[PDB]
């Protein structure tokens, strides 16, 4: 009533490669020969954008690389040649019966060549230190693939349970990711130590990379 | 030329009520075949909840059966969403959207930007903004990173631009993380030429509407 199931839930593909995504309805969405399945593209922080309506019609202003086919209960969205600007979550949506329903979404990433992170490190500001806390920030810029390991070390003690990280979505400019790790400590603990290091392991690095600084140059 | 702009997002007490509005521009609400609300829980997933047809007929998703009211004001060129008895399950980005006169009607080619609604007992808290200053240790190649740390706010979201939106190239604004405190923290960085650190001014503009907090931090 009426359940749509997409597959895969996530996929990754080389630029230019053909991509096909499936939608399966629990009941038919056929009506007067027409099939009432729709496809949307949702880029991060954006409202869904309509690509296909009535199973096979291209919405005005959408590139011809996107096409839909199918009928009854089996439907297919295809992207003839995956472009970088195509990273997004794709949804199917039936418009045959109220409670109009969407698929669970398919996540689509462009698989590019390996690119090693550029690492940067930031000491806490004096402005924050006066507040009684110290956040240390590590930036991993423009890398691929998404997976990356970040280890925090303070005077060579491995910090654990002490930090949090966030990863940007894929950048269409160059198909990379970026990542921010923030190490949080009390001012007291921060003032009691000297060496603050951010160690990074990534597929694009033959060996780990460490960016560090000494309090007293922070 | 047709834009949907929404208001009424923010913090709501569990059991309370929300009142969203979609202000239509470049188009008469009366010409629309259908106007709709569709929400998306942060987790992910879209859910249609309500519609009003040009004749005034209203329709609701039973998933929220009897705690919703879609309505419109033609003289204001606006339509509204009201819900009450709000649960945490109701936390979501809420989108308005226009339906079509063609091909079965119930597909949406025009959407608003969305507004986040957070249902929580916690209270609003504005962020602190601290510098992420450039350094030799943030200058790997002939290019430097600097940024802003937007720390300890509630609830989402926070808006971050650089130099009043004049600087977009090289800018990365990261997803907020939820701290063990229950507060959010977020960083924004920009990679720039290290040779301009002495001559160019870099200001991150931070907005947190829920607490009515705006900050401009030079780094």
Numbering used by the authors:
A (entry chain L): 1 to 218
B (entry chain H): 1 to 219
Task: Quote the study that presented this structure, word for word.
Omalizumab has been approved for treating not only patients with severe, persistent allergic asthma, but also patients with recalcitrant, antihistamine-resistant chronic idiopathic urticaria. In contrast to an ordinary anti-IgE, the therapeutic omalizumab does not bind IgE already bound by FcεRI or CD23 on the cell surface or soluble CD23 in blood, but it can still bind to membrane-bound and soluble IgE27. Such a therapeutic anti-IgE averts the anaphylactic effects exhibited by an ordinary anti-IgE because by binding to soluble IgE, omalizumab blocks the interaction between IgE and its receptors, depleting both free and receptor-bound IgE. Furthermore, omalizumab forms small immune complexes with IgE11, whose fragment antigen-binding (Fab) regions remain free to bind allergens; thus these immune complexes serve as “antigen-sweepers12”.
